[PDB]
Amino acid sequence: AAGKYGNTLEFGHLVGGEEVLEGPLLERRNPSDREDVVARFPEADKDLVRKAALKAREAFAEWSRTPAPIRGQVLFNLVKILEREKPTLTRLMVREVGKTPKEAAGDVQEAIDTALFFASEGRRLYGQTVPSEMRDKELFTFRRPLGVVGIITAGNFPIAVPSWKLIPAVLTGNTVVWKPSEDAPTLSFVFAKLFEEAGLPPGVLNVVFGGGKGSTGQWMVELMDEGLFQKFAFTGSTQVGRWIGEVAGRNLIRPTLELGGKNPLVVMRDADLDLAVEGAWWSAFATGGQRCTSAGNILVDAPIYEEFKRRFLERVEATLVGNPLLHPEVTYGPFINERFFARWQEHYRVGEAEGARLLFGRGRITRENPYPRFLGDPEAGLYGWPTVWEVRPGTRLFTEEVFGPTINLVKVDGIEEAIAVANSTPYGLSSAIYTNHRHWAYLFKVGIRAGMTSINNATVGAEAHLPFGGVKASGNGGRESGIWVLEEYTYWHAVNEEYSGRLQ
Amino acid sequence: AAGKYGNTLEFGHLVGGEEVLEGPLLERRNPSDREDVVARFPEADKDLVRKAALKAREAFAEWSRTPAPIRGQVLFNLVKILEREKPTLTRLMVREVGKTPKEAAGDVQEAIDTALFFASEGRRLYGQTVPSEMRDKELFTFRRPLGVVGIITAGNFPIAVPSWKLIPAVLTGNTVVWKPSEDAPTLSFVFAKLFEEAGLPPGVLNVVFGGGKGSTGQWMVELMDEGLFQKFAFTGSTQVGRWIGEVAGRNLIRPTLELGGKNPLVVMRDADLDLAVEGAWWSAFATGGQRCTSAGNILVDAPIYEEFKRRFLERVEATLVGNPLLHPEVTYGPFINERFFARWQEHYRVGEAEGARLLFGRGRITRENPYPRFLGDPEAGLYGWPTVWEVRPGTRLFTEEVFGPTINLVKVDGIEEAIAVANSTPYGLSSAIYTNHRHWAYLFKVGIRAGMTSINNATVGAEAHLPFGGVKASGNGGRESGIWVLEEYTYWHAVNEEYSGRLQL
Amino acid sequence: AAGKYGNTLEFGHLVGGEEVLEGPLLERRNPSDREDVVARFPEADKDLVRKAALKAREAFAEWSRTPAPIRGQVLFNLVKILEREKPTLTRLMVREVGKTPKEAAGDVQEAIDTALFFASEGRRLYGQTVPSEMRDKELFTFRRPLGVVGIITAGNFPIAVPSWKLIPAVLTGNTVVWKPSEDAPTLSFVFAKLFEEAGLPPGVLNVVFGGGKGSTGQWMVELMDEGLFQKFAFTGSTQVGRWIGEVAGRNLIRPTLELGGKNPLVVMRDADLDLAVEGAWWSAFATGGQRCTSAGNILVDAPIYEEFKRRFLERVEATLVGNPLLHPEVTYGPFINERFFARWQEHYRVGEAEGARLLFGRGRITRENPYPRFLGDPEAGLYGWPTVWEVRPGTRLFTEEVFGPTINLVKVDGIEEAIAVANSTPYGLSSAIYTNHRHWAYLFKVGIRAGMTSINNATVGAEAHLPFGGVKASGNGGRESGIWVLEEYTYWHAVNEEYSGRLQL
Amino acid sequence: AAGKYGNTLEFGHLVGGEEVLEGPLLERRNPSDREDVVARFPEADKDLVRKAALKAREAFAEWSRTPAPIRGQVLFNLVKILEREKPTLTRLMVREVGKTPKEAAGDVQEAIDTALFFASEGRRLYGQTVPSEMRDKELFTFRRPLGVVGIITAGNFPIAVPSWKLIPAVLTGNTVVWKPSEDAPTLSFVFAKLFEEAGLPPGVLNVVFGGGKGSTGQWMVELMDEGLFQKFAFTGSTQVGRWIGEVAGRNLIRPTLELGGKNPLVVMRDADLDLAVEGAWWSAFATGGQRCTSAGNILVDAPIYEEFKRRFLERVEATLVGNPLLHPEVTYGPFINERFFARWQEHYRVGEAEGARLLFGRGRITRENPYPRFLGDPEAGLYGWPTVWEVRPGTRLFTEEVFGPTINLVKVDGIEEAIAVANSTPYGLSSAIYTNHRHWAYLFKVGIRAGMTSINNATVGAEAHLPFGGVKASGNGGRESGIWVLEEYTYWHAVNEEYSGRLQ
Ligand SMILES: [Cl-]
Ligand SMILES: [Cl-]
Ligand SMILES: [Cl-]
Ligand SMILES: [Cl-]
Ligand SMILES: [Cl-]
Ligand SMILES: [Cl-]
Ligand SMILES: [Cl-]
Ligand SMILES: [Cl-]
């Protein structure tokens, strides 16, 4: 078929390098305009996943024992292919998940950067030579591939965040089974095909499509109990993370777990207001607030509270919203999926119930409830009014993660107290402070309990060559970019060579 | 009291730096001679563990914010105090767990080495400065303490293996709750007091004594569900490890898990037989086969099978066994506890049942079933005949870990097949090959699935400044000594500083 | 003009991104066939070098303060452009320096690999965060660009070896003045233009052509005394290196110095002869023996001496020699320049004089003195008979580097003595041993005084992502590839931040 | 003999572990009181140095091939012995070089810290395992000892700064010839004996006493031309450094060169004045201004110039000066040697000549020119009035290093200009800025051309586990503490092992 803004594509799983149309058909509709159908694709039953894992096990023998620098050459080709395809993938990603074209070119770019980074790590992966305490004896360490990796990914960063996992996994000589978000199946099929074209041998990467709970994603976790995975990486909700953590736990796997957060952004009295407003604004409404790292609470220092709040609302009022395929100028578009739209709609009622003051936002944008800076037709999909609250700490709006274009303001007095309030959340992913006093940035830097912190910078837009990850309910201690991710996809082999003829 | 070979000591838990007699008294008997009672000490009820965790939470505020190089000064004092106490700790460790005096001085030494290593890491703990892609912007990383660490340790290495966990934990600014093996409570009490004398502030280290299943150790794991631990380290059985793994799992903790193994030792046709026999022998019978890393199977290359086997048994015949307090010359002594003795006694009947050929070993040493090279009285404790089997791969003697002085022989042909058989085991901790062909050592080096490998060297005797740890059922991927353990007791804080006063994205 | 095998090209210096015809014209002839003229190009007078250094000083302001990851983007484009141009650079390099097409594609490849390596180091260059001993105080380190780098390169690896210097220099934010070998000026001009196309801002790279002694290269060193260079890298003879060393010395510069060697290759009795012969053979005659790392002495273990020698000469007999443009199948071609041909011709007379036994080789290949496996016309250039000697240690053939297709045999007895003889040379660059006894490779590994060592592998063919460099007369301790070269083109800035608002000391 | 405040000690060189009284007698007098004679000791003629180098060459065979962790055990014993001796060495160092007892206990402490640091590096010295691009092939690197190291040291940090060189040298398996400052020969003899007691085998450390120019130090450099040294480290003047650099240069040695500096300290308008005054004050007058890192110029931001200058002079007026053996409370004491006293006396006349304004200081303290806060008798030795100038940039007081208790003030306007003025000096060792604006500290941090920089902290008191060293005329690129010094005393051996039977 042709769809409304492009072709409807039908395709199967990729197992040992073949297409496999095996299972009930699902379909992904353009979230910006649900009349456009983007793709049609099977639900992998659990036995197909079992097969995919075992093609991966067969492929690992040859791939793992392929020279690491030659594995790098595959990634180098991928860098080139990704570069070529960057305009295509940008178009497709606006169609399939409703990111703005600026943000979507950015997504693709991070995969390009990731691929370049690891092409080169083919000739690094440094281990150690160590001095023995004994004469006539040498000591070594060596990073070794774990085996078959199972990977589950969300759809809000559908090329970038998969690449953080897929690329270092195959570079260190592992083999992969990948279950991508039913929100972005076409991009995943493509990205798997780009990898094929780049030279990845068949079976090294296998892709199985489907849903999460009661679907493929769950079957996929359950297979850790049959020992088909030597490693597992997941991006998603803390509820699901804890479960996957437990399953990996009893099967002696360290899993990688990016689990979202409630990201504090502090604005001290001595801050540059315009800059801090631009950063709160962008932290809140980038990707329509559907980022692990989107800001949950702006903590504004009491002296500047009123002035900040007036300027922030001015800025929020200006947010454009709309079909980013038809209106590239727009700040954000639709909800990626139905599930986030629903949780976000409920957040209004929890707010009113616990007594938050709603400063701006009239829930879902529709004909009967139109939004002044909307562009296009708000009924073609699920779009949300920008939303702003004032909230007491301790409350549920304050502590619980809510994907969607919502942000809270909170009045704080101390730096003392700003730090205490910033920490009053089960999460600990991302954080930010806007200030000019060296001492104030120092105290927050070391007083916050987060895995990432920004000074005079948004909670979003971490650079791709720094360790990405959260502490507390935001993850289990692993990190995803740079040299730090090598701990995730390898283990330490320790070797001692005796050249004397003596026991010692 | 006075005991038979020293004092019987009574003592409590150490919580926020005070002694606490709270719970039913247990007792640790001298395993070499169970008439000697070494200690009486309480079983921490779960609420006292809860309190210990919360003293640790109170103490973490000031310890974590104590300069890392000053935390190193504490460890440097500990190195000196440990040095002073090395002869007394050696005596006490032969009394309390029945290690030979040579092996027990060695145990103490690894704590000394560990403490020196980390005294100095107080002025390292390096993180990174990183270039931004943006002008007027700097990037950093910082290693940060996790919080309160819960630690459970076995008793077979009662000073060394605890120190691998305790020392890097407090050095990186964490606070600790420690539950030591009911097999070695006096050494743990001491070691906690040496730490105190070295300058560790009270509450930074808390010690709660007791048992494992249905006791303190279990209560201690269960508390991860109340979020009292931000990290957990365990040495023990894979059965228990899997459970601890699961609990830590749902609480988003990476735990540290040394879970023992079935350690393959390969002897290729071109090996030096006398040297390979000394290494199989020492791998098997060091600590009476009660090490995570003790050898489980000798894989002998078919061409030298018969010659090796004859010489190995000659060497095993020579093993001395006895009360290492009265006979220091002895190779190994008693079982640490009655649990290991029991599992090892059953292994004879599993052996007979699946049809292993028993080449040597008459089960428990007693007066009625004496051992030619025994010294002392074998009824005063649980002592085991050195034991040798031939076994087919696939069997339970071949695949299952059995603490005790038992080893299997297996005939192999290729290097091909040596590697395939070495890997036919759920475990993946330690390994060894005896060979002189460079290509053969290379193929084993890269063909084995283990986290430690020895060439012309035993499966035991890892050096303390190399990463200790197993793959497969032997652990979950963490590592314990050297710079590698810093990943366990810290997390990565990533900081980005904008000085350019504009949003650039 | 049109030449005989391509165009004759005329071109100038590149200074702040402009072409500059300033100075007396030199010419580079096709060494394989000197009727073919490859290029005409100026000799930079010392004042033009002075200007090039000062364009580099002007450009450093904005390049150094260009985000390192963006500097990497330039290199990533260069990788792509180099890939596109790999067949043309291969052709041109066979024309301009007489490398065989296989070896010349390899040369280009190492630049490609180098550029990819460093494209990625744009997002690394890691420094350190370090714990203070004081409360409320943080410590950092930062790698910083040195400034303007002066670079002099040989012509035998005219794209690879320049890239080891050029690329890490500009990546770490330095600016460059480059004086390339008058043996390979067209490739250098090209490579500088590829860099331009890749996005290198003008003035960041400046190229000044000319000669060495009494020419541009000398003027270029002399300018360290006017402080126009904050760093200097050189590939060449130890004679020249010592001088450059001294000049950099008094100007407080650590310079980078690859200074060639006399590379010992040992063949123990237990070696695989065919493999060790292939490795001695390729070590000797790769690039016609015109590599820093080409083998100088084969040390053969007395038991296999005669057998090895017979097989080696059989293999040497088989060497093909010829115009690699017309006969790609050929092992090596002409001398790069007339200087090397001259020194190598004299080596025959030094040999006769000190009493070496000449086993094979009749000096220069000519029509009147033809070589059985020559292809083409040997008078069109300077070509050399493969040459083999037996020599006593202590002699000048044994100790002195001789670019050209010459190799010595030496009889040795121990591993003992193999190592002692291997070390009896002023140089210490590369080394190799062929053996199967693990202990013998270990003793050589730790007994040799060299900065690179091969086990059952040639003295040539270092991998590009390992540190390249020599000890003794082969260099001053710096290293060229991988992470190790970052020490050369940066300095360590150490920063300490006090937030505690009090003097504490 | 007994001297006036302790024993006069006579002793020889230490060569292959024996005492050697061979040469004309020199003597070191107590600089605080020159009637007290501290020591009597020979001048090593050049042939004795030649012998010392060759004992070191013989000893290297055994020491280098001694397990690195066992070499660490020697240092661990040294830590303990140094701890025991810390009160003795502190007394002796106040007697022999006239440091205050606080500063001298500090000196000894840095050696203790250095020794602990490197005791532990016995089990580190990490090298690399690297992946080959070829199948059946492994790559390694290994740090290797250079050989015999020649070491020349100044006397102003007579235990600390020698330990930065001596300890990492012997730990990495090198052997040493050491020529210590004729200003501190007793401490060096002692420290060499403590090393002996700690377990250092004889010949691994050799000590040869004497002078510099036309004496042992020079003979010692000249021996690089006979190839007796594989490495050379020097602390001293830039003139001498350049020479040693050249000699090492032609002999293909990378030498280590700490060469002093003219250390800028900037005080921005937003600074904390009391803190910045305490830091200028301590930067200037610690060790009587006889530190490589002592401050040369205070750059005061125009808005606060007058206020700062008044408070600084108040603080300087308070400086106590005197015989630190008899008056521990004193800030600084005598000149270490006659040479610095002389250069510092000349600096007054260069100042007047180029027109600097002298704000405070009457040259040498004597009976006829007494100093209000002097304690003791100023004629017993060479003591200097604290000295303060205002100076134009470009002048010689501004650009040239002057050991002694002198400091300049300079008015600056920009941060722009503060950085330009801070850099207008041939040196580039140490630096500092006092400020609270994050942007101001950032611009200085990255605009200065120095190898060490302090924010709201003195130019002195670098921590011992950070890389110590200067750029420009302050050194040649090497660094001295921490992991960074390992580049100085080792070289990189690169090994490739082929296990196939193939050429590739
Ligand atoms: Cl999903
Ligand atoms: Cl979800
Ligand atoms: Cl949904
Ligand atoms: Cl409110
Ligand atoms: Cl001196
Ligand atoms: Cl001087
Ligand atoms: Cl003098
Ligand atoms: Cl003035």
Q: Mutual orientation of helices D68-97 and D101-121 as an angle, nearest 10°?
A: 170
Residue type at C403 in one-letter notation: F
The SS3 call for residue B37 is: strand
Phi/psi at A324 (5° precision): -70, -15
Task: Enumerate residues 6+ apart whose C-beta is below 8 A from D395.
Answer: D354, D356
Beta bridge partners of C491: C144
Report CB contact under 8 Å: B465, D121: no
In this structure, are residues C142 and C39 in contact, taking their beta carbons and an 8 Å threshold? no
Report CB contact under 8 Å: C476, D254: yes
Q: Which of A65, A451, A478 sits opposite B494 (nearest CB)?
A: A451
Q: Which of C68, C128, C436 sits opposite B438 (nearest CB)?
A: C436
Task: Give A180→chain B minimum CA distance, Å.
Answer: 23
In this structure, are residues A458 and A430 in contact, taking their beta carbons and an 8 Å threshold? no
In this structure, are residues B17 and B189 in contact, taking their beta carbons and an 8 Å threshold? no
Beta carbons within 10 angstroms of residue B353's beta carbon? 11
**Nearest to C455, CA basis, from D138, D132, B444, A135:** D138
Report CB contact under 8 Å: B497, A456: yes
A88 CA distance to ligand 3 centroid (A)? 26
For residue B79, the chain D residues in CB contact (below 8 A) are 76
For residue B69, the chain C residues in CB contact (below 8 A) are 131-133
Cα four-point dihedral sign B459, B460, B461, B462? positive
In this structure, are residues D70 and A133 in contact, taking their beta carbons and an 8 Å threshold? yes
Q: In what order do the strands lie in the sheet with A137-145?
A: A128-131, A137-145, A490-498, B452-455, B432-434, B263-267, B295-301, B406-412, B387-390, B357-360
Q: Which two tokens stand for residue A158?
A: 């559908």
The SS3 call for residue D393 is: coil
Rounded CA gap, A473 and D298, in Å? 50
Cα angle C18, C19, C24; round to 5:
140
Q: Which two tokens stand for residue B210?
A: 């007791």
Residue type at A412 in one-letter notation: V
**Nearest to A409, CA basis, from A302, A333, A331:** A302
Residue type at A424 in one-letter notation: S
D216 CA distance to ligand 5 centroid (A)? 11
* H or E segment to which residue D356 belongs: none
In this structure, are residues D68 and D38 in contact, taking their beta carbons and an 8 Å threshold? no
Q: Which domain holds residue B211?
A: 9-260+466-493
Q: Which two tokens stand for residue A239?
A: 């509820």
CATH of the domain at B140: 3.40.605.10
Interchain CB contact of B455 with A (< 8 Å): yes
Closest ligand to the CA of D339:
7
CA distances from B34 to B41, B221, B404, D440 (A): 17, 31, 19, 73
Rounded CA gap, D147 and D230, in Å? 5
For residue A115, the chain C residues in CB contact (below 8 A) are none
Task: Enumerate residues 6+ apart whose C-beta is below 8 A from B60.
Answer: B145, B147, B148, B173, B174, B175, B204
Rounded CA gap, C99 and D486, in Å? 39
Q: Would you mind telling me the total number of residues written for chain A in this entry?
A: 504
Report CB contact under 8 Å: A499, C442: yes
Q: Which among B43, B121, B258, B480 is annotated as catalytic?
A: B258
- D residues 282-311 lying closer than 8 A (beta carbon) to B: none
Rounded CA gap, B363 and D305, in Å? 90
In this structure, are residues C452 and D494 in contact, taking their beta carbons and an 8 Å threshold? yes
Task: Give B119→chain D minimum CA distance, Å.
Answer: 8
**Nearest to B176, CA basis, from B149, B216, B203, B201:** B149
Question: Which amino acids of A are annotated catalytic?
Answer: 258
Beta carbons within 10 angstroms of residue A58's beta carbon? 12
Report CB contact under 8 Å: A250, B249: yes
**Nearest to C230, CA basis, from C471, C41, C489:** C489
**Overall resolution, Å:** 2.9
Q: Which two tokens stand for residue C217?
A: 């290269």
Interchain CB contact of C126 with B (< 8 Å): yes
A236 CA distance to ligand 2 centroid (A)? 6
Rounded CA gap, B427 and B257, in Å? 13
Phi/psi at B371 (5° precision): -115, 125
**Nearest to A13, CA basis, from A179, A155, A228:** A179
The reply to whether B237 sits in an annotated binding site is: yes
Cα four-point dihedral sign B92, B97, B103, B108? negative
Method used for this model?
X-ray
**What letter does residue D247 receive in the DSSP assignment?**
H
Phi/psi at B221 (5° precision): -60, -50
In this structure, are residues B293 and B308 in contact, taking their beta carbons and an 8 Å threshold? no
**Nearest to A258, CA basis, from B230, B128, B252:** B252
Beta carbons within 10 angstroms of residue D7's beta carbon? 12
For residue B483, the chain D residues in CB contact (below 8 A) are 124, 126
Q: Mutual orientation of helices A185-198 and A68-97 as an angle, nearest 10°?
A: 150
Q: Mutual orientation of helices A305-317 and A273-285 as an angle, nearest 10°?
A: 50
D338 CA distance to ligand 7 centroid (A)? 5
Task: Give D321→chain A minimum CA distance, Å.
Answer: 36
**Nearest to D289, CA basis, from D477, D458, D411, D151:** D458
Rounded CA gap, A197 and A85, in Å? 12
Beta bridge partners of B235: B258
A contact chains, 3+ CB pairs < 8 A: B, C, D
* End-to-end Cα spacing for chain A: 74
User: In the A/B pair of chains, how many CB contacts fall below 8 A?
Assistant: 200
Q: Which two tokens stand for residue A47?
A: 């036995």
A450 CA distance to ligand 3 centroid (A)? 29
**Which residues are within 5 Å of ligand 2 (an ion), measured at CB?**
A 237
C325 CA distance to ligand 2 centroid (A)? 65
**What letter does residue C9 receive in the DSSP assignment?**
E
Nearest-Cα residue of chain D relative to residue B499? D439
Rounded CA gap, B207 and D347, in Å? 65
Rounded CA gap, B216 and B49, in Å? 8
Cα angle A445, A446, A450; round to 5:
75
Rounded CA gap, D465 and D445, in Å? 20
Reading phi first (left if > 0) and then psi (alpha if -120 to 50, else beta), residue B21 is in beta
Nearest-Cα residue of chain C relative to residue A447? C136
A49 CA distance to ligand 2 centroid (A)? 21
For residue A241, the chain B residues in CB contact (below 8 A) are 252
Task: Give A412→chain D minimum CA distance, Å.
Answer: 22
DSSP C436-497: -BHHHHHHHHHH---SEEEESS-SS---TTS----EETT-SS---STTTTHHHHEEEEEEEE
**Nearest to A448, CA basis, from A461, A434, A430, A466:** A430
For residue A133, the chain D residues in CB contact (below 8 A) are 67, 69-70, 123
CA distances from C227 to C146, C232, D385 (A): 12, 11, 37
Q: Which among C96, C258, C480, C488 is annotated as catalytic?
A: C258
Task: Give D500→chain B minimum CA distance, Å.
Answer: 7
Q: Which two tokens stand for residue D92?
A: 């002796």
Position of tokens 């509450």?
B203
**Nearest to B16, CA basis, from B62, B54, B69, B47:** B54
For residue D458, the chain C residues in CB contact (below 8 A) are 503, 505
Nearest-Cα residue of chain A relative to residue D439? A436
Reading phi first (left if > 0) and then psi (alpha if -120 to 50, else beta), residue A278 is in alpha
* H or E segment to which residue A434 belongs: strand A432-434
DSSP B96-123: HH---HHHHHHHHHHHHHHHHHHHHHTT
A435-445 exposure pattern, b = at least 16 Cβ within 10 A, e = fewer: bbbbbbbbbbb
